[PDB]
């Protein structure tokens, strides 16, 4: 029997790495996140998601004893809305997404996801 939570964090990590780190065209967009710790608190879920950005991959953890550079709090249904910085600004303004710490981290993350969709690799 494999516990559920580590399987979920491993799955998210695999998805993020294939989507964001596989293409070398995105290197300059990923550089903006190097060394950043982004904590994601999904409302209604009892656990946190912590994304640690390095040069060759992002690591996803279910716990983090240290400091996060940016912390985002939102319901899961906000994720398909994070299409670009415009939508991100509207979500912050409406209170659908709450940001603590460095707002630039989540702006750079959303910008990277936007470019990852643009880039056909």
Q: How far is the CB of 21 from Ca ion (least distance, A)?
A: 11
**Residue 114, Ramachandran bin (φ over 0: left; ψ between -120 and 50: alpha; else beta):** alpha
End-to-end CA distance of the chain: 36
Is 74 a binding residue for a copy of itself by CB under 8 A? The answer is no
- Determine the Cα–Cα distance for residues 12 and 76; give it in Å rounded to an integer: 13
The piece of 31-39, 41-49, 59-67, 103-111 that touches a copy of itself (CB under 8 A) is: 41-49
Nearest residue (CB) to a copy of itself, 35 versus 80: 80
Residue 121 beta carbon to Ca ion: minimum distance, rounded to whole angstroms: 5
> Is 17 or 104 the residue whose CB approaches a copy of itself more closely?
17
**Coil, strand or helix: which one is 9?**
helix
Instruction: Determine if 102 is a binding residue for Ca ion (CB under 5 A).
Output: no
Q: Identify the residue among 77, 86, 94, 121 touching a copy of itself (CB under 8 A).
A: 77
103/98 Cα distance (integer angstroms): 10
Which window, 30-38, 40-48, 65-73, 101-109, contacts a copy of itself (CB under 8 A)?
40-48
Question: Which one, of 17, 59, 25, 36, lies nearest residue 107 by Cα?
Answer: 36
For 80, list phi and psi in degrees, rounded to 5. Answer: -65, -10
In the complex, the residues that contact Ca ion under the rule CB under 5 A are 32, 59, 67, 69, 83, 114, 116-117, 119
């Amino acid at each position: 029997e494999m516990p559920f939570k580590p399987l979920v964090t491993a799955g998210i990590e695999s998805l993020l790495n294939t989507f964001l780190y596989r293409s070398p065209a995105l290197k300059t967009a990923r550089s903006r996140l190097l060394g950043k710790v982004l904590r994601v608190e999904v409302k209604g879920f009892s656990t946190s998601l912590i994304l640690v950005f390095s040069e060759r991959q992002v690591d996803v953890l279910g716990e983090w004893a240290g400091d996060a550079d940016c912390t985002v709090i939102a319901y899961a249904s906000v994720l398909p809305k994070l299409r670009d910085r415009q939508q991100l600004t509207a979500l912050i303004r409406s209170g659908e997404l709450e940001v603590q710490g460095d707002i630039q981290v989540v702006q750079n993350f959303v910008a990277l996801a936007d470019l990852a969709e643009f880039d056909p690799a």
